[PDB]
Amino acid sequence: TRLFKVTALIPSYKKVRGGRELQNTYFTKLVEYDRWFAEQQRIQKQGGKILSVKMVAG
Amino acid sequence: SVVTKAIVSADAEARYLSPGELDRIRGFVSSGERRLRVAQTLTESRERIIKQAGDQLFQKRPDLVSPGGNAYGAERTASCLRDLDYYLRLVTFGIVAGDVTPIEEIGVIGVKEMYRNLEVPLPGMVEAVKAMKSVATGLLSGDDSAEVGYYFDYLAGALA
Amino acid sequence: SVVTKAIVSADAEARYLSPGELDRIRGFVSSGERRLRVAQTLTESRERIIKQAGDQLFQKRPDLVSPGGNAYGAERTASCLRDLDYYLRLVTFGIVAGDVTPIEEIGVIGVKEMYRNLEVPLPGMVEAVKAMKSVATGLLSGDDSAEVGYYFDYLAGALA
Amino acid sequence: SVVTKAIVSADAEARYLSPGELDRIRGFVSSGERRLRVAQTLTESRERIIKQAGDQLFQKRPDLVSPGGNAYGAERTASCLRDLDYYLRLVTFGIVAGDVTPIEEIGVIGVKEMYRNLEVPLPGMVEAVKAMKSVATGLLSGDDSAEVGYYFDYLAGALA
Amino acid sequence: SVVTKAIVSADAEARYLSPGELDRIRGFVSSGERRLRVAQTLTESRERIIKQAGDQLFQKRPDLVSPGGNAYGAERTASCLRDLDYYLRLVTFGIVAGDVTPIEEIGVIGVKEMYRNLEVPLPGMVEAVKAMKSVATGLLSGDDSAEVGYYFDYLAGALA
Amino acid sequence: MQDAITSVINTYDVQGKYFDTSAFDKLKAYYATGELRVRAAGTISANAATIIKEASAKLFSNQPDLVRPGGNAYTTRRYAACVRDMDYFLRYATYAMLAGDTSILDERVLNGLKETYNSLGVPISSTVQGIQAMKEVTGSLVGSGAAKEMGVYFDYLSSGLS
Amino acid sequence: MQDAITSVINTYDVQGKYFDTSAFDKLKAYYATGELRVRAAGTISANAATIIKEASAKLFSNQPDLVRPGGNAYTTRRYAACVRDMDYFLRYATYAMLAGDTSILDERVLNGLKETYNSLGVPISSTVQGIQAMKEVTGSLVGSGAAKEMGVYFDYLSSGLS
Amino acid sequence: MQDAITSVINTYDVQGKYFDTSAFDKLKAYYATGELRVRAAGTISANAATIIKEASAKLFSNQPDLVRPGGNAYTTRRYAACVRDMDYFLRYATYAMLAGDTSILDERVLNGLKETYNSLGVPISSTVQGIQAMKEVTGSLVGSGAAKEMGVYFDYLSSGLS
Amino acid sequence: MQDAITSVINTYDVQGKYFDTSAFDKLKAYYATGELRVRAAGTISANAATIIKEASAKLFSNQPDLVRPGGNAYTTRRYAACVRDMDYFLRYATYAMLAGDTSILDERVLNGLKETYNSLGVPISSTVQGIQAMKEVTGSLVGSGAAKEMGVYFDYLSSGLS
Amino acid sequence: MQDAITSVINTYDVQGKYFDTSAFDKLKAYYATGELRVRAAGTISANAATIIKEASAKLFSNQPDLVRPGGNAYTTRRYAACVRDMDYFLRYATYAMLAGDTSILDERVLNGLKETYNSLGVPISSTVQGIQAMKEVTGSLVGSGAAKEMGVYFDYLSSGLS
Amino acid sequence: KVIELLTKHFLGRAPQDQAEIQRYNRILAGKGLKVAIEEVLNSDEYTQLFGEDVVPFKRYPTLPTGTYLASVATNDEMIQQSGSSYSPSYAGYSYP
Amino acid sequence: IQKGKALRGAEGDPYTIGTRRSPKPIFWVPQGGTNPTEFQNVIRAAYRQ
Ligand SMILES: CCC1=C(C)/C(=C/C2=NC(=C\c3[nH]c(/C=C4\NC(=O)[C@H](C)[C@H]4CC)c(C)c3CCC(=O)O)/C(CCC(=O)O)=C2C)NC1=O
Ligand SMILES: CCC1=C(C)/C(=C/C2=NC(=C\c3[nH]c(/C=C4\NC(=O)[C@H](C)[C@H]4CC)c(C)c3CCC(=O)O)/C(CCC(=O)O)=C2C)NC1=O
Ligand SMILES: CCC1=C(C)/C(=C/C2=NC(=C\c3[nH]c(/C=C4\NC(=O)[C@H](C)[C@H]4CC)c(C)c3CCC(=O)O)/C(CCC(=O)O)=C2C)NC1=O
Ligand SMILES: CCC1=C(C)/C(=C/C2=NC(=C\c3[nH]c(/C=C4\NC(=O)[C@H](C)[C@H]4CC)c(C)c3CCC(=O)O)/C(CCC(=O)O)=C2C)NC1=O
Ligand SMILES: CCC1=C(C)/C(=C/C2=NC(=C\c3[nH]c(/C=C4\NC(=O)[C@H](C)[C@H]4CC)c(C)c3CCC(=O)O)/C(CCC(=O)O)=C2C)NC1=O
Ligand SMILES: CCC1=C(C)/C(=C/C2=NC(=C\c3[nH]c(/C=C4\NC(=O)[C@H](C)[C@H]4CC)c(C)c3CCC(=O)O)/C(CCC(=O)O)=C2C)NC1=O
Ligand SMILES: CCC1=C(C)/C(=C/C2=NC(=C\c3[nH]c(/C=C4\NC(=O)[C@H](C)[C@H]4CC)c(C)c3CCC(=O)O)/C(CCC(=O)O)=C2C)NC1=O
Ligand SMILES: CCC1=C(C)/C(=C/C2=NC(=C\c3[nH]c(/C=C4\NC(=O)[C@H](C)[C@H]4CC)c(C)c3CCC(=O)O)/C(CCC(=O)O)=C2C)NC1=O
C-alpha cells in the first residue's frame, strides 16, 4: 500500500552504551509498505516493543 | 537456556530447528534431573559455601578487611558475602538453564562499571569466585564438579 | 558562538570539555569587552557606514542604479541600502559571538537562491560587502579593524 | 595540538579555517612563551617531582609497596616511578602542545587494558597522578600551577 | 540517448526491458529520419544561426563588446560565437539522441562554476541562447520548431 | 525470549530467593515434557508446507470471497502475504510450544501485529479462522498429547490478534 | 542548542534591531561570569567519577530498595544503566552551565525522556532524587559561588522529569 | 501514485470486471487531452523559474512583512525554503495535470503539510496566496484550456492546505 | 596529520627524552612564525576564488589544448572538476602552511593521486603547471615572507605529483 | 570452516564416494579425542587471561625494546593491541584444537597476516616469540597430553608467521 | 566492484569474506541495486555501528583476517573512472 | 631512569604510525533542536561519505 508511521522503543540488553542513544531507543519514523514487514521483524528480534502503528497514506 | 538459544538461532535464519538443535534440546532435557540434583546440593549448602569462600578470600587477601579496605567493617563484609550469595544463586540458575545466559544477564552485563562505581577490586571478585568454585566443587561428584567448575570459570573469566 | 561550537564538539565524542576547549572559551570570554566595544562603535556609526558604502558601491557599478539596473529608483536603492544594513548587523552579531555563525545562519544559508529569485547580481553583493569592509575598518583602530576584516572577508567569500 | 585540532576540524568540513579558529591559533601562539617556560621548569625538576610524588604515593598507599602489592620490591617500585616519569613527560608535551592530545594518545587510549594486563590498580594511578600534581604545581606560580593542574586533572580523570 | 536510458533502468533492476521500454525504443527509432532531417537543417544553417544570434545578443548588450566588457575585442567576441557554436552542436546531438543528455553532460553540469571562473555573466548566456532559439526555430517548420524549442528551453533554463 | 526454565528463573530472581520445591517441581515438569515437545516440533517442521497448504485451502473454501476480487486476499501479492503470515504463525507457534512459554508470541508475533492489521484492514475474524485451520491440521498430524499443547499457543495467537 | 550570546543575537535578530545598552549589559554579564563557569566546568570534569560515586551512594542509601531484587536498579546491567544516566545528567548540566542556557537540556536530554522512562519502568521520582544528590555533591565541590549556577540547571533537569 | 488510466484500472479490478463502454469512454477522454497536457507541461517546465519569481514577488509585495524581520520568511534560509516550497507546488501541480489525477498531491505533498506548517508556524493563508499567485502566472503563460486544467490542481493544493 | 609541535614531540618521544634546548629552540621558531602563518591563511582564504581564477586563466592560456574539444579540461563538467582540484590544492596547501609541516599533504592529497590521475586520464604535467601558477598568484598576495613559506608546500605538491 | 569430520566429508564428496572403512576409522579417531579436546578447551577458557598475562610479561622481559619508548608495543594504544593480538592467537588456537584441524588457522588467522603486520610495522619475529611464550605458558596448565595437542596448533601459527 | 563500493560507502569497509560477495552477487543478479542497498542498510552491522542517526564513516576493522588491509586499500582508493560516457579525453599535445 | 630508556634509538616508532584511525569527528543529527550550520555540516558529510 503506502507509508506507515511507526513508534517503537528498543531497549538495550547486550551492553551499556556510552553515547547518548536516546534517539536510538525511542523513535518515530515513516516506514513505507514494502519494508515494514522486515523492519517490524527486526524490531521484534532486537527485543524492542512496537508502541503504535498508523497508516499515514494509502 | 539451551532451548532459548536454539530457538533464537533458528529464528535468526527464519527457519525451523535443524536436527542439531533438536538433538541438543533432547540431550539437554534428558539430563535435567541431575542438573536439578546439583542445583539442590548447591542450594542447601548455603552457609558452608558462602562462609568458607569468604574466609578463604579474606585469608588470601587481608587488605580487603584490613583498615582502609573495601570490605573493612561489619556492614561492608556483609555486603561482600551478600555479593557472593548473589553469584552462587546465579550459578545455580545457570546450572538449571543449561547455559550462562542467566548468569550473564543478571550479573555479567555491566558488572565492571558497577564495581568501578563501587570501588570494588575486580581481582577480589575473581579470587572470591575461585574460592566459591573450590568449595562448591568439593561438595559434588567429579562429573558434576567439572560442570559446576565450568560455570564458575565462566564467571571468573567475565570478572577477569 | 565559540562556546556552542566547543560544546557541540565535546558532545559529539560524549566527553567533557578538554583543557584546550576550556582555554579557548577562557580566551573568548577574556576578550569580550574588546569585541563589545568594537560592536558598539560599529552600531553607533551604522548610518554613516551604510551611506558611504552605498556611495562606493554605486560609484564602482553605476549600472546598478542606471536604467535597466536592479537598483534603479528610490525604493530599489533603499532596498539595496537596507540589505547593506542587514549585513552590517550580522557582522556586529558575529563580532559579539566570536565566530561567523550568526552571519552564516541569517544571511548566508540559501543566499544564492534568494538573490537568484530576486534578480540581484552576486558580484554586486561581493563588492558592496567590500565597500562596507573598507568603510567600517576605517572607523576602527588597526587592531580592531584586523578582526573585523576577517568577518567581512568571510561574508564576501560566502556571497562569492 | 591546537593547530592540529583546528585544521582537522576545518578539513572534516572541507573548508578553510574560520576567523574564530585563526583567532584561537593566534592566542595559542601568542601564549607559547609562557607555556614554554612552564615546560622548561617542569623539565628541570624531573627527579625531585618523581621522588616526592613516589614518596607521597607510597605513604598514602602502603599496600602498593607492601608484600603482595603490585609495586612490591625495588624493581617494581622503579617501574612504578618510571610510569610516573612517562606521565610527567606526556604532561610537558601537552603543555607545549596546548591541548591534552599527546597525553590522550600516548598514555590514555588503551590504558585500562594495559594496566589490567599488568595487575596495576587504576585507583593507584589516580592518587599517583594526584600526588604528582601536588608536587608539580608546588614548583609553579599560581597561573602556571592552574594551567598544569588542568592537564593533571585530565590525566587523573582518564585513569579513573 | 533513449536506448541507453532504457537499458540502464532495466539494468538497475536486473531485468530485461519491459514491453513499455521496448515500445518507447520502437517509437524513438521510427522517428529517426525526422530527427536527422532536423539536425541536418540545423547543421546547414550553423553560421547563419550563430551570426544572427550573436548580433541580437550584442545589440541588446553593447557594454559586452565595449571597452571593459567581457567579450570586448575580436578574440573575445570570437570566443563568444564559439560558445554559441558549442551549444548549437550540443542541441543537434540532443536531437539525434532523442534526449538532452548529451547537452546536459557536455555543457550543463558545472556550467555555472565554469562561467563564474571565467567571469562570464550567466544572464548574457541565457539571452544569447534565447536569441539562438528564435533564429533556429525560424528556420525549421512548425512541428520541427516545437521540438527544437524544447531543447533550447532546456538549455536556457539550465543556464538560468 | 524466555522459556519455562527462564520463566521460573526470573520469577525467583525478582524475589532474590533460591530454588524451592515448587521451582524444582516446575523444572521437572518441563524436563518431562521436553521429549514430547521435541518430537512434536520435528513432526511440525516436517509437514509445515503441507499444513499451510491445507489450512489455507480450508480457509479460502470457507470464505471464498477472501480470494475473489474485492477480497483482502485478492491478488497474487496479497495471497502471498496471507500464506506468508500463516507460515510465520505456524513456525512461531512451534517455537512457543518447544519453549513451553507464550512469551515469544508476545515479543515476536503480537508485538505490533494487531495495530498493523487494523491499519491495513485485515479481517481479524478471517485471521482467527485461518489460525484455527492451522490448529486443526496440526493436531491431526502431531498427536493428541502434543495437539493439546499446540492448541494453547494457537489459542494464544487467536486471542492476541482478536 | 543555544548560548546566552546566541540567545541575545536571536532576540535582536527577530526584531531586526542592532544591539543597545541592554544587550551589551547582558553580554557583559555573561563575559564576567565566563571565568567562573570555566573553573566550575574544569572542577566538575576532573571529579565526574567521584561526584557520580558519592551521589549514587547517597541515592542508594536513601532508597536501598532500588538495588535489592525487585528494584529498578537490581542487576549489573540496570545498575550500570542507572549510573550511566547519572553521568548523562552531570555532563549535560555542565554543558548547560558553560552555555548559560537550558536549551541543550531540552533538545538533547529531556526530548522524550519522560515517556522513555515510563515505557521502560524507570522510577522518575527516584531519578529526580538522584539528580538532587548530584546537585548536593557538586555544590559541595565547585564552591558557594558556582553552586547556585550549577543548581539552576540541575533543578531544570529535575523539573523537566517531574 | 495513480493516473486516470490507473484509476480506471483499479476500479474495474476491484469490481473484478473487464473494461466496459463507460471505462473506454473515460480512457478516450483522457487520451484526447494528452497533447494539450503535454504542451502545457512543456510550457510550464520551460518557464518554471519565471513563474516562481513572479509569484513570489507578487506574494511578498502584497504581504511585505513576511520577509521583513519577525516574518516567517525572514532569513536567506527562510526565504529559500519558501521559494523552494513554491517550486514544489508548481512541479507537483504539473505532475498531477499530466496524470489527470490529484493523488500524487495527496500522497506526496499534502500528507502532513498542514500539521508541519502549523508546528513550524508557517502561515497557511499566505501560502495559499502564493499558490494562487502561481496559478495566475501559470494561467497567463499556458493559455485558456491549459489554465482550466491546471487550476483544478492549484485549487486542490490550496484546499488541501486548509 | 602532524604539525611542527607534534613533529618535535614525536622526535623526543621515540627517544624517551624530555625537551632539550634544541627542542625549545624549534618550538620558539614555530611560535615566532605563528602570526605570520595566521595572517597568510586569512589572506588566502579571503582570496581563494580570485587566486583560482588567475591560476586557471594562466594554465588554460599557456595550454589551450586542455580546453579544446578532446582535452581533459573540455566539458563544463571537466572544467569544473579541474577548478575543483585546484581548490583542493590551494586549501590543503593552506592547511600545511598553518601546520608548518607537510604530513597532511602526504596523507590526504598525494596518497594514490598519481595512479588516480593516470586512471582518470588527467595530465600530471598540466596539473603541476596549474599548481605552479597558483603558487605565483598566491605569493604576490601573501607577501615575500609568507610567499617563501607557502612556496614550500606548493613545491611539495608539485614534487609529489612529478 | 573445516574440522576433522568436515575434512573427511569433503574428501569423500569431491570423489562422489560414500564413506569407506578408512573414513570411519578417522571419524572414530576424532570421536575418541573429542573429550580430551573439550576438557583442554575449557581449561584454556578458564585461564586465558592468566596465560596472556604471563606470556606477554615473559615476551616483554626477553625483548624490553618492544615496550620501551620507540618500541612497536610502546603506547597504551599499541600495548593493548599487542595483548589483544595474543588473545586472538590463543582463542583461534583453541578453536583449531577443538575442531581437530588447522584449516581455521589458515583461513582466519594466517590469511594475509604477514603483509598486514608488514604494512603496520609489527615485528613478525617478535610475534612468533610471543606465540611461543603462550605455548610455553599453556603447556604447564593443560597437561602433557593436552599440551602436545595445543602445541601442534601453536607451532602451526608460528610456522605460518615465520 | 559494485558490492565493494556498497560496503565502502555504507559500512566504511571492504567486503569481509567471500560469503558476503556470494550473497550480494545473488541479490544483484536477481533483484537489482535497490535490494542490495536495503540489504546493506538493514544489516545488523549498520545498526550497531551507526544506528539511526550517525552518518557512516570510514572504518578499519581488526577482524576478520585480511579485512583491515583490504579496508585500508578501499578507503584510500579514490574514484578511478570518468564521470561521463560522453566526450572522452585523450593523451596528446598540440605544439605551438 | 634506567627503566625508561629508549632501546631502538631515533629509529623507533612514533605514535603516528601503526594502525589507521577512523575520522575522529563523528557526524550525527540529534533528535530535537538542531542548529542550521550544524545541519548543513551533517548533510555535506553524508553526501561526502
Ligand atoms: C543524554 C540523554 C539520555 C538519557 C537521560 C538517557 C536515559 C536512558 N536510560 C535508559 C535505561 C535505564 N535507566 C535506568 C536508571 C534508573 N534506574 C534507577 O531506578 C534510577 C532511579 C534511575 C537512574 C538514576 C535503568 C535501571 C535503566 C535500564 C532499564 C531496563 O533496561 O530495563 C535508557 C534506554 C536505553 C538503555 O537501556 O541503555 C535510556 C535512553 N538516555 C539518553 O540518551
Ligand atoms: C545480582 C547481581 C548484583 C550484584 C552482584 C550486585 C553487587 C553490589 N554490591 C554492592 C555493595 C558492596 N559490595 C561489596 C563487595 C566487595 N567488597 C570486597 O571488595 C569484595 C572483593 C567484594 C565482594 C566479594 C562491598 C564492600 C559493598 C559495599 C560498598 C560501599 O558501601 O561503599 C552494591 C551497591 C548497593 C548495595 O550496597 O547493596 C551492588 C549493586 N548487585 C546486583 O544487582
Ligand atoms: C607512555 C605510556 C605507557 C605507560 C604508562 C606504560 C606503563 C607500563 N608499566 C609497566 C610495568 C609496571 N608498572 C607498574 C606501576 C604500578 N605499580 C603500582 O601498583 C602503581 C598503582 C602503579 C604506579 C603508580 C609496575 C609495578 C610495573 C611492574 C609490573 C611487573 O613487572 O610485574 C609496563 C610493562 C612493560 C615493562 O615493564 O617494560 C608498561 C608497558 N607503558 C607505556 O607505553
Ligand atoms: C562544450 C562545453 C564548453 C563550453 C560551453 C565552454 C565555454 C568556454 N568559454 C571560454 C572563454 C569565453 N567565453 C566567452 C562568452 C561570453 N562572453 C559574453 O559575456 C557572452 C554572455 C558570453 C557568450 C554568449 C568569452 C568572451 C570568453 C573569453 C574570455 C576571456 O578570454 O577573457 C572558455 C575558456 C577557454 C577558451 O578561451 O576557449 C571556455 C572553456 N567550454 C566548454 O568545454
Ligand atoms: C512474524 C510476525 C508478523 C506478521 C505475521 C506480520 C504480518 C503482516 N501482514 C501484512 C499485510 C497482509 N497480511 C495479509 C493476510 C491477511 N489477510 C488475509 O485475508 C488473511 C485473513 C489474513 C492472513 C491469514 C494480507 C492480505 C496482507 C496485505 C494487505 C495489503 O496489502 O493491503 C503486513 C504489512 C507489510 C507487508 O505485507 O509486507 C505485515 C507486517 N508482521 C509481523 O511482524
Ligand atoms: C538578513 C538576511 C536577509 C537578506 C540579505 C535579505 C535580502 C532581500 N532583499 C530584497 C529586495 C532587494 N534587495 C536589493 C539589493 C541589491 N540591489 C543591487 O543589485 C545590490 C547588488 C544589491 C544590494 C547591495 C534590491 C534592489 C531589492 C529590490 C528587488 C525587487 O524590488 O524585486 C528582498 C525581497 C523583499 C524586500 O524588499 O525586503 C530580500 C528578502 N533578506 C533577508 O532576510
Ligand atoms: C585473528 C587474526 C588477526 C590478527 C592476529 C590481527 C592483528 C592486527 N594487529 C593490528 C595492529 C597492531 N598489532 C600489534 C601487535 C604487537 N606489536 C608488538 O610488537 C608485538 C610483536 C605484537 C604482538 C605480540 C600492534 C602494536 C599494532 C598497532 C596498534 C596501534 O597502532 O594502535 C591490526 C590493525 C587493526 C587494529 O589493530 O585495530 C590487525 C588487523 N588481525 C586479525 O584479523
Ligand atoms: C583532496 C585530495 C583529492 C584530489 C587531489 C582529488 C583529485 C580528483 N580529481 C578527479 C576528477 C578530475 N580532475 C580533473 C583536473 C585535471 N583536469 C585538467 O586537465 C587539469 C590539468 C587538471 C586540474 C588542474 C578533471 C578534468 C577531472 C574529471 C575527470 C573525469 O570526469 O573524467 C577525481 C575523480 C572523482 C571526481 O572528483 O570527479 C579525483 C579523485 N580528489 C581528492 O579527494
Residue numbers in the entry:
A (entry chain z): 2 to 59
B (entry chain n), C (entry chain r), D (entry chain s), E (entry chain q): 2 to 161
F (entry chain u), G (entry chain t), H (entry chain v), I (entry chain y), J (entry chain w): 1 to 162
K (entry chain 0): 1039 to 1134
L (entry chain 0): 940 to 988
Can you list sentences taken from the study reporting this PDB entry?
Here we show the cryo-EM structure at a global resolution of 2.9 Å of the 5.9-MDa PBS from Anthocerotibacter panamensis (hereafter A. panamensis), a recently discovered Gloeobacterial species that diverged from Gloeobacter spp. around 1.4 billion years ago. The two-fold symmetric PBS contains twelve APC hexamers assembled as a heptacylindrical core surrounded by twelve PC hexamers, with approximate dimensions of 273 Å (width), 500 Å (height), and 129 Å (thickness).
Instead, ApcA2, ApcB2, ApcB3, ApcC2, and ApcE form the bottom pentacylindrical core, and these five proteins are phylogenetically close to their homologs in crown Cyanobacteria. However, both ApcD and ApcF are absent in the A. panamensis PBS. Although ApcB3 only exists as a single copy like ApcF of hemidiscoidal PBS in each bottom core cylinder, ApcB2 (β3) is found at the positions occupied by ApcF in other pentacylindrical core structures and is likely the functional equivalent to ApcF that occurs in crown Cyanobacteria. The EET from the top core cylinders to the pentacylindrical core is also efficient, given that the bilin distance between D’ and B’ cylinders is similar to the ones within the pentacylindrical core. The linker proteins were suggested to provide microenvironments for the bilins and are key bridges in energy transfer in PBS, namely the linker-guided pathway. The final overall resolution of APC core complexes ranged from 2.38 Å to 2.73 Å, allowing the assignment of all APC subunits precisely based on the corresponding amino acid sequences.
